[PDB]
């Protein structure tokens, strides 16, 4: 069946990106997904999005700029120490100049960078660049 | 290397088809694969038409026609030249030959 | 079998293309014309080339020839092609139109046009060929 909603979502927006479309319908949605897209959005990789509320599960409609190359998830969610982060981002990310690992932490959901500031570890979600 | 997309036979979405006996051969072939040629002609052929037409007790008596369904195993057809091989691209065309002028 | 060479047809083509005014429908005429106009060795070559100049021109008088573009014949086609009847075929006092066309016009606020006549829609729908 469908598990890891996040994964499917990101596949969707990336596929709609490669094709070169303007908008996406990603369904269903979660708070996790939402905050995720938010973290992406603040850096500008995506844009502004609207949550259509339904009485079961929300649908998210997303506006796009071509700036997003790859958007991905890492399943399973890996427990990542502060020491370990380096190896990870050297593996996943295209350059040390840009791109972000998204981790869920006790502090909240955020960038690898923000967590290097807050001095916290956590579980890994995904990445984009 | 796969030769035909359809594997020479019409079989799709079903497991096994009833086997039939070749007209010429007696060689067993499944009905889907079997080359079928239907034959509608006249019992008596070209000249004996005008011949017998005169020997009748009836006026405007139309000659009966013979109807025969034929099955040929892949071999026999290529032998009788009912079917002949064609080029790689031209194979793809399943539109029947232009006997209609 | 008698058939003309590449050299024959190409030479006759270029010759007719350049000098077309000078040529005429007589063999000997264009023979003596080609002895001058171009430079050819021997004889049979010459005679053949001239012969195809002749034949080609016999074909010219009937109409346009695929291989040569003569001049002024782009201007002469500019003459022939330029034509017009006293009134345009686009001018009709009554043009018939379907109700739906009149609808699409009514969206464009042209539903007031005078020349129109609304014609009855055909009741059966068959636009398609009977597959088989």
């Amino acid at each position: 069946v469908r598990m890891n909603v996040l994964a499917d979502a990101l596949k969707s927006i990336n596929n709609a990106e490669k094709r070169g479309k303007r908008q996406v319908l990603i369904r269903p949605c979660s708070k996790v997904i939402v905050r995720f897209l938010t973290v992406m959005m603040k850096h500008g990789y995506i844009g502004e999005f609207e949550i259509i509320d339904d009485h079961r599960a929300g649908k998210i409609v997303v506006n796009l700029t071509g700036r997003l190359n790859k958007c991905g998830v890492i399943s399973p969610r890996f427990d990542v120490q502060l020491k370990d982060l380096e190896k990870w981002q050297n593996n996943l990310l295209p350059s040390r100049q840009f791109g972000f690992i998204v981790l869920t932490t006790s502090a909240g959901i955020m960038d690898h960078e923000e967590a290097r500031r807050k001095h916290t570890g956590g579980k890994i979600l995904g990445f984009f660049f | 290397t796969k030769k035909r997309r359809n594997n020479g036979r019409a079989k799709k979405g079903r497991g096994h088809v009833q086997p039939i006996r070749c007209t010429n051969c007696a060689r067993c072939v499944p009905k889907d694969k079997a080359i079928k040629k239907f034959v509608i002609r006249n019992i008596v052929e070209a000249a004996a038409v005008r011949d017998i037409s005169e020997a009748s007790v009836f006026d405007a008596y139309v000659l009966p026609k013979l109807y025969v369904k034929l099955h040929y195993c892949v071999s026999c057809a290529i032998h009788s030249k009912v079917v002949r091989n064609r080029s790689r691209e031209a194979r793809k065309d399943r539109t029947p030959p232009p006997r209609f002028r | 079998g008698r058939v003309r060479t590449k050299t024959v047809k190409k030479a006759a083509r270029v010759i007719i293309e350049k000098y077309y005014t000078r040529l005429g429908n007589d063999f000997h005429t264009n023979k003596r014309v080609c002895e001058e106009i171009a430079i050819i060795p021997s004889k049979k070559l010459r005679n053949k080339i001239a012969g195809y100049v002749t034949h080609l021109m016999k074909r010219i008088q009937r109409g346009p020839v695929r291989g040569i573009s003569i001049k002024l014949q782009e201007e002469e086609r500019e003459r022939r092609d330029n034509y017009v009847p006293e009134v345009s075929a686009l001018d009709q006092e009554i043009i018939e139109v379907d109700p739906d066309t009149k609808e699409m016009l009514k969206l464009l606020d042209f539903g007031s046009l005078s020349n129109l006549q609304v014609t009855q829609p055909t009741v059966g729908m068959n636009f398609k060929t009977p597959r088989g």
Binding site: - | - | E78, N82, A89, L90, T101, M104, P121, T122
Partner: protein, 216 residues
């Protein structure tokens, strides 16, 4: 159009269109073209939305205009219904025509005598002549076209949604384009009805040549 009252389509033109029947397309419809479609009536004939047509005409017009030297516009017609039309259009506009066989490798090949590097490309039908378009793919030519309700939009840039089948519709579309680009250039006027009749841009056929030459 800039929605301006100047360029807004007058009724007379609408009459010319309704005459030449440019608003009637074939039974087949491409999912790219559905934007320009109005609605399908009975008898399977799709009806073209004419305002959109007009706007496309003007867009294409400004497109042609923007080129400085007029000879950088190439105008190509493969089939017969467009030959003369293309000829006259180029004659008035001062652009380089290709009528009849478009010699493949014209754009892409420096050694040929056919070689040219047009800035824009204008084409009668996408379906009939793919060749020039696929060349525009290689040489960076922006591409104008006349699309029926059924045409591929592949390698076309700004398309004009008319009937390219019947002779009249084609002649009229060409003539109108000429009128528009010319009234745009500053030559002629927005006031005076143009001297040249749309009928000049039509297609002969041998039957009409015989009729009108044997009428004299």
């Amino acid at each position: 159009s800039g929605a301006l009252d100047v360029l807004q389509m007058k009724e007379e033109d609408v009459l010319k269109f309704l005459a030449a029947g440019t608003h009637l397309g074939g039974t087949n419809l491409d999912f790219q073209m559905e934007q320009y479609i109005y609605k399908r009536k009975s008898d399977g004939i799709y009806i073209i939305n004419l305002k959109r047509t007009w706007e496309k005409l003007l867009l294409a017009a400004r497109a042609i205009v923007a080129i400085e030297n007029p000879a950088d516009v190439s105008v190509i017609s493969s089939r017969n219904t467009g030959q003369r039309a293309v000829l006259k259009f180029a004659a008035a506009t001062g652009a380089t025509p290709i009528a009849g066989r478009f010699t493949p490798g014209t754009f892409t090949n420096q050694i040929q005598a056919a070689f040219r590097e047009p800035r824009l490309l204008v084409v009668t039908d996408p379906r009939a002549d793919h060749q020039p378009l696929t060349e525009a793919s290689y040489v960076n030519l922006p591409t104008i076209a006349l699309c029926n309700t059924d045409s591929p939009l592949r390698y076309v840039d700004i398309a004009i949604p008319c009937n390219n089948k019947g002779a009249h519709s084609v002649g009229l579309m060409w003539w109108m384009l000429a009128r528009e680009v010319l009234r745009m250039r500053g030559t002629i006027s927005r006031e005076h009805p143009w001297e040249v009749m749309p009928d000049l841009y039509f297609y002969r056929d041998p039957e009409e040549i015989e009729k009108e030459e044997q009428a004299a």
